[PDB]
């Protein structure tokens, strides 16, 4: 989400903590896209989904 009056798009949620360094590794319903793979390194998919 874009931070208001700063033109900066900032993640929230789990990625508001992990990309800020406030958290360690995450297990989650990790829906995988291009951008999350761009900022978070990923393991191989544990549970194939749709």
């Amino acid at each position: 989400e874009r931070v208001q009056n700063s033109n900066k798009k900032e993640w929230n949620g789990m990625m508001g903590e992990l990309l800020s360094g406030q958290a360690d590794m995450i297990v989650a319903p990790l829906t995988i896209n291009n951008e999350r793979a761009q900022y978070i390194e990923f393991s191989k998919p544990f549970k194939y989904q749709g």
């Binding site: 896209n33 291009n34 793979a37 191989k44």
Partner: protein, 49 residues
Amino acid sequence: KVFASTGYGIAIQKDSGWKRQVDLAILQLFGDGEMEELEALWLTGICHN
């Protein structure tokens, strides 16, 4: 109910940095669903419905 659960991928030389940008393009493919259309072009049966 497949007894195994694995995936088909691509083999790369170890410590080759290109595979990151390759996987970015793989997720670029995943972001629009063209492989479903190629599955409609390739992987489609007759009475599998």
